[PDB]
Amino acid sequence: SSVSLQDFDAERIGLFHEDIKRKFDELKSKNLKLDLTRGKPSSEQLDFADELLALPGKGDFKAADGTDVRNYGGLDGIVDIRQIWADLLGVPVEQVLAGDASSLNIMFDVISWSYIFGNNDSVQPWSKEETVKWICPVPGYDRHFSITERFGFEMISVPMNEDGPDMDAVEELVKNPQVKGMWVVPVFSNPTGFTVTEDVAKRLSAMETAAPDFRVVWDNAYAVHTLTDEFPEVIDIVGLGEAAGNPNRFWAFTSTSKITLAGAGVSFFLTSAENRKWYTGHAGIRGIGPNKVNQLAHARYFGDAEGVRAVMRKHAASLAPKFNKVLEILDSRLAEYGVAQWTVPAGGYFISLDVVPGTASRVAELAKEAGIALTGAGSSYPLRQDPENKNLRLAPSLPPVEELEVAMDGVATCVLLAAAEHYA
Amino acid sequence: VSLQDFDAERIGLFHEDIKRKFDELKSKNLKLDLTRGKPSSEQLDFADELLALPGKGDFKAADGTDVRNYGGLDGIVDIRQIWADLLGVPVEQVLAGDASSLNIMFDVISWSYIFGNNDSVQPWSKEETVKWICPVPGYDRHFSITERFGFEMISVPMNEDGPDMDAVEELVKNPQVKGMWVVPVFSNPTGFTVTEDVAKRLSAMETAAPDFRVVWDNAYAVHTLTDEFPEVIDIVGLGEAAGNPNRFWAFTSTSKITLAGAGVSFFLTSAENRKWYTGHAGIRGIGPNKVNQLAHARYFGDAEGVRAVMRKHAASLAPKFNKVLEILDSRLAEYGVAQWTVPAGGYFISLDVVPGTASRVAELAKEAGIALTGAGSSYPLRQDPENKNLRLAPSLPPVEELEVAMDGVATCVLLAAAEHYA
Ligand SMILES: Cc1ncc(COP(=O)(O)O)c(C=O)c1O
Numbered sequence: 001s002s003v004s005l006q007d008f009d010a011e012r013i014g015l016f017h018e019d020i021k022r023k024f025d026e027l028k029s030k031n032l033k034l035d036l037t038r039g040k041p042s043s044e045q046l047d048f049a050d051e052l053l054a055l056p057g058k059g060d061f062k063a064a065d066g067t068d069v070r071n072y073g074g075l076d077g078i079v080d081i082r083q084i085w086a087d088l089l090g091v092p093v094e095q096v097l098a099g100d101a102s103s104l105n106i107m108f109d110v111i112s113w114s115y116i117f118g119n120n121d122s123v124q125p126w127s128k129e130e131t132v133k134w135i136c137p138v139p140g141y142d143r144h145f146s147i148t149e150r151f152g153f154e155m156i157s158v159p160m161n162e163d164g165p166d167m168d169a170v171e172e173l174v175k176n177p178q179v180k181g182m183w184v185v186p187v188f189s190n191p192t193g194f195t196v197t198e199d200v201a202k203r204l205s206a207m208e209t210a211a212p213d214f215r216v217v218w219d220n221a222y223a224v225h226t227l228t229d230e231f232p233e234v235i236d237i238v239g240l241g242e243a244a245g246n247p248n249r250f251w252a253f254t255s256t257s258k259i260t261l262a263g264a265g266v267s268f269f270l271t272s273a274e275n276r277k278w279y280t281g282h283a284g285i286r287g288i289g290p291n292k293v294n295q296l297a298h299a300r301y302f303g304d305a306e307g308v309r310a311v312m313r314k315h316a317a318s319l320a321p322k323f324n325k326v327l328e329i330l331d332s333r334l335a336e337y338g339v340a341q342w343t344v345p346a347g348g349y350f351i352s353l354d355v356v357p358g359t360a361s362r363v364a365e366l367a368k369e370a371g372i373a374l375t376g377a378g379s380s381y382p383l384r385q386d387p388e389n390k391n392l393r394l395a396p397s398l399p400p401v402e403e404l405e406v407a408m409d410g411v412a413t414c415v416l417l418a419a420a421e422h423y424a
Numbered sequence: 425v426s427l428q429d430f431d432a433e434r435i436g437l438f439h440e441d442i443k444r445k446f447d448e449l450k451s452k453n454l455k456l457d458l459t460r461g462k463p464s465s466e467q468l469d470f471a472d473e474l475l476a477l478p479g480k481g482d483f484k485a486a487d488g489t490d491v492r493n494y495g496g497l498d499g500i501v502d503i504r505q506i507w508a509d510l511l512g513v514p515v516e517q518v519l520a521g522d523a524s525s526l527n528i529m530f531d532v533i534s535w536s537y538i539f540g541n542n543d544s545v546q547p548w549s550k551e552e553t554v555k556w557i558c559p560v561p562g563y564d565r566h567f568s569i570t571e572r573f574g575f576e577m578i579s580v581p582m583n584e585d586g587p588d589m590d591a592v593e594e595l596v597k598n599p600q601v602k603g604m605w606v607v608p609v610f611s612n613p614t615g616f617t618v619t620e621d622v623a624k625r626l627s628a629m630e631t632a633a634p635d636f637r638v639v640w641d642n643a644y645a646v647h648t649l650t651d652e653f654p655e656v657i658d659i660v661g662l663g664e665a666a667g668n669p670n671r672f673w674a675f676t677s678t679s680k681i682t683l684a685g686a687g688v689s690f691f692l693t694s695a696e697n698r699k700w701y702t703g704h705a706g707i708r709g710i711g712p713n714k715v716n717q718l719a720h721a722r723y724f725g726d727a728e729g730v731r732a733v734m735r736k737h738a739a740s741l742a743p744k745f746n747k748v749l750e751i752l753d754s755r756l757a758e759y760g761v762a763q764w765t766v767p768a769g770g771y772f773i774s775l776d777v778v779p780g781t782a783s784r785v786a787e788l789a790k791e792a793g794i795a796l797t798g799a800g801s802s803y804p805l806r807q808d809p810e811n812k813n814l815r816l817a818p819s820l821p822p823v824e825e826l827e828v829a830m831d832g833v834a835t836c837v838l839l840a841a842a843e844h845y846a
């Protein structure tokens with residue numbers, strides 16, 4: 001009685017194909033120009049931080065330790081913003097470095113410097129190895145993969161599961177000394193929405209790796225970025241490494257790009273004492289230090305960690321209805337057919353949609369014909385290669401709800417037409 | 425009579441007297457510092473408004489870009505256009521970054537080492553040896569970058585008209601030589617300025633390395649002490665005219681214009697070099713801080729607004745330089761122990777003392793509570809082969825502290841000289 005599309009008989013699927021073609025032609029007739037690709041805050045979210053454009057303000061230029069933020073010096077970032085983030089994340093302030101307005105920049109730099117110089121645990125620079133391998137949980141973040149691609153690292157994929165990366169697979173892979181590191185987005189992961197559990201974190205902390213200088217990039221970009229009233233747990237991953245006897249394993253990051261201003265916020269690097277010393281030793285050759293004025297501006301804007309969480313409540317209220325609309329259209333158009341699976345995230349910036357394998361690129365092509373921009377098939381995979389051609393990323397944050405409704409209704413029609421083509 | 429011409433008896437008397445004066449200095453329990461090439465608080469106060477810019481509701485660049493959101497690797501048009509106008513170059517030449525030009529210099533060297541630059545046949549990491557030309561006295565933070573990368577640094581004199589071009593043109597015949605540092609206007613620390621003729625030689629010279637780069641770090645491009653602004657040679661244009669369009673990586677910043685560490689940096693280079701840079705920069709991140717760029721554009725308004733700011737800096741700094749020069753004149757000139765630059769701009773005075781004594785002068789000054797930068801600080805690997813050069817940084821302290829500090833330094837110079845000759 002219930003029958004999925006893949007189980008429709010030959011005639012039934014042919015007739016379905018004719019029907020959904022009608023619907024697609026109706027869609028194309030609307031002459032839409034809509035875009036579901038932009039993983040960035042809306043204007044209304046950026047409005048929240050309007051005061052920050054006037055901070056720290058005339059005459060307000062002393063950090064909490066007396067530092068004149070207007071003059072040179074200090075590689076670590078100012079104590080005011082470091083302490084707020086330490087309090088927010090529940091870690092010792094000593095673990096926290098605060099940078100400029102890009103956490104990606106710091107991730108690039110620590111990889112780059114490991115490549116040139118070696119890290120503090122290296123016996124030689126990564127540039128001297130015949131092959132460098134890097135573990136990539138998928139679906140994941142294109143800008144991560146682009147860094148390791150640029151450096152010529154062989155990227156080895158593993159599944160990103162509901163509780164984190166597949167640890168049976170990771171534990172096996174790291175037995176090869178070619179493997180130097182891995183990427184993970186541990187909370188509301190980009191784009192699955194999945195979150196690393198304590199058990200998986202402990203496995204990452206305790207596993208033994210063949211490379212003596214192996215590093216996990218723990219890019220906690222969505223550390224407080226809830227859609228609900230409940231904030232996710234902040235695992236003190238640096239502390240878990242230390243407890244396991246692998247203190248230098250984790251390079252942890254976060255930022256305020258999706259809290260304040262996207263591209264004009266403050267970044268953070270959290271790591272062990274030996275790793276911090278290594279980083280600041282190199283960073284002090286690269287320059288005199290980060291922008292302390294913007295750090296003070298941010299400290300004044302937030303006040304304290306509760307002030308950060310109050311801002312995140314504002315973002316949640318803005319984003320929630322957008323996620324809800326996408327989810328409700330996916331359900332109302334697709335659920336009955338058994339053609340697609342999608343995440344129901346509790347935070348972060350994306351919904352991850354799996355369609356009939358072999359059809360994701362066709363869905364994106366159909367959507368384009370109908371004036372709806374989707375992120376390309378494979379975009380969440382190393383080298384833009386999804387071996388199942390099934391996954392699509394949806395970005396609800398920017399457009400208004402009315403645009404999301406029309407666009408997602410269109411996407412649903414494209415999913416069904418591509419599926420009908422595939423099965424017929 | 426110069427000190428070096430005093431006879432044994434006379435130098436002995438001099439030595440005893442100056443040693444007593446040094447002891448009297450050391451008893452004052454001073455805590456002074458002539459090392460910091462930083463703007464003073466009074467200079468930083470000029471930009472107080474900038475701490476509140478661009479202000480609520482003011483977030484659009486001139487082309488309509490929302491500066492609060494992601495994207496754009498080149499910097500915003502407003503600040504790029506002001507600097508293009510200020511420097512007299514096409515706006516297309518100008519990239520605007522974050523608050524450190526050193527960071528960009530480091531990056532382009534690092535990326536040449538890892539990846540090669542756009543004219544490389546292989547990354548610099550693949551070379552057995554990389555050599556780099558270092559005009560001296562020069563900037564320690566430049567030399568620290570090339571030291572960190574393990575490049576062999578080859579010194580050449582920084583003369584009044586720029587680097588010794590006979591020496592440079594010979595050195596670049598060696599394909600191991602991949603580049604060169606220069607501070608081309610009010611050079612750090614000599615105050616010397618590259619002439620048109622030397623710039624044309626740099627632009628036209630044949631280099632053995634196909635991917636040779638000059639770092640033209642024009643940190644003091646508008647940083648006059650007199651209110652006469654120096655010529656801005658369009659060095660990128662000169663390289664283009666000479667048929668070496670990709671030779672120059674040019675830099676400047678607002679660190680000594682607005683806020684030191686919270687300003688805006690600039691990278692000026694050829695089209696092919698810009699494409700190479702932004703290709704790599706776009707992997708490193710999503711782009712620079714456009715809000716601070718807009719803040720700076722609003723603060724200045726236009727190139728004339730930048731020059732008005734530089735006049736404020738000149739009026740603050742000129743009396744400090746004058747006071748230092750007056751004390752050098754009144755304590756040292758008659759003895760023939762020292763020579764010093766008399767700069768028209770920039771942040772330093774370069775002082776040469778009796779050869780073999782610079783480290784002793786710095787040690788004596790430290791005993792007396794006066795911090796001087798160490799001997800060799802303006803040389804690669806901190807190695808001044810004559811042990812004669814010292815840097816003086818007048819900008820931060822008030823002139824009252826400068827007079828006490830410099831009087832003490834002069835006593836140290838004379839004691840070290842007396843020890844040397846006795
Ligand atoms: C996983 C992840 N990391 C990093 C970033 C970008 O961060 P930043 O602006 O600090 O470079 C993003 C985008 O928000 C992201 O999704």
Ligand SMILES: Cc1ncc(COP(=O)(O)O)c(C=O)c1O
Pocket residue numbers: 287288461523524525526527563607612641643676677678679680684685689
């Ligand atoms: C020659 C030179 N270049 C660069 C700098 C530092 O510039 P930034 O703050 O833009 O890194 C200085 C200090 O003013 C300098 O003397």
